[PDB]
Amino acid sequence: GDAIKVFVRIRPPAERSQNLCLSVLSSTSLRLHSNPEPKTFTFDHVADVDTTQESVFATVAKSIVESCMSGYNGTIFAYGQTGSGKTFTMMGPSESDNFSHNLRGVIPRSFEYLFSLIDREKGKSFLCKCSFIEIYNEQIYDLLDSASAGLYLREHIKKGVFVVGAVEQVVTSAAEAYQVLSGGWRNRRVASTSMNRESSRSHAVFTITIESMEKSNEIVNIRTSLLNLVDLAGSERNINRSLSCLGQVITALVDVGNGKQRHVCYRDSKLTFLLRDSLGGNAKTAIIANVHPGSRCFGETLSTLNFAQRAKLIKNKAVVNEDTQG
Ligand SMILES: Nc1ncnc2c1ncn2[C@@H]1O[C@H](COP(=O)(O)OP(=O)(O)O)[C@@H](O)[C@H]1O
Ligand SMILES: [Mg+2]
């Protein structure tokens, strides 16, 4: 198959604290200063503390969206310790309403790009629906409906795992996509301040189904793509168990992809299950690993880099999800 794509993004430390623990050697390479012997890692890209939101999009998402348009499933998720910048990365800063639009993250920029590609693709027609859900403590909540209850996971023949009874909102424009996101991202923030004891333990999954029909009478070709944009629970220890499953799954896959054989429990967590195609399955996956340089993050940084390194070993098999009728 095709190896998944791993990127490392180093967020800048808070202003006015030296002594970094991490040095970027090149656009593919970084050195972790561990003693006595330093380690170096190689990824598809390494972005330093100055990297802009837009840069991130171009390096990571642009490709995924494109292959989405061509009918492949695709997935981007952000992994890393709490406070490493996952949310800033996929979403943007909070709290900034009347300004700093250049700060919006991957997900908003993805909407923009997707819809302009579509606009330009026009015979053929397009249909997009969004879902936004949150997994907290092995438990599902619908961000589009705060009154929803009893959400649960279910397999399909099409191979899709999905959340049964989650709102699927139809959107015809970036702008419409944007309130779906806004409304949900708020519910997420709003729930995190009582409990939902922390937002640092919840995974957030924003999904767009992208379905085109090329229809030249009588015949109709149908392409359908599932795009998952995920902001994970923080990876620090104690280690949240769904993330532990994530580690276990990544590991088993590697044993398998290169030799041996192994059992991979996708069903050990709602996350690994819902993401089953994203790992080793039918989809084009990109992982952004967020790390905070700086010396007191050394341990969690080391874990993140270790995790991401294996992840880069995994291979998916992704096909155009197609169909013909009429
Ligand atoms: N690229 C960046 N540039 C500047 N500040 C950032 C960047 N990424 C994150 N931050 C800031 O660091 C803090 C944690 O980022 P956040 O996205 O909340 O972390 P996480 O989602 O990993 O818990 C926030 O204050 C955030 O605004
Ligand atoms: Mg966060």
Author numbering: 10 to 26, 33 to 137, 143 to 257, 273 to 361
Q: Could you share sentences copied from the article?
A:
Kinesins constitute a superfamily of microtubule-based motor proteins with important cellular functions ranging from intracellular transport to cell division. In the early stages of mitosis, during prometaphase, certain kinesins are required for the formation of the bipolar spindle, such as Eg5 and Kif15, which seem to possess partially overlapping functions. Kif15 has recently come to the fore because it can substitute the functions of Eg5, and may itself have potential as a prospective drug target. In contrast, Kif15 works as a dimer by crosslinking parallel kinetochore-MTs and we demonstrated that it does not contain an MT-binding site within its tail domain.
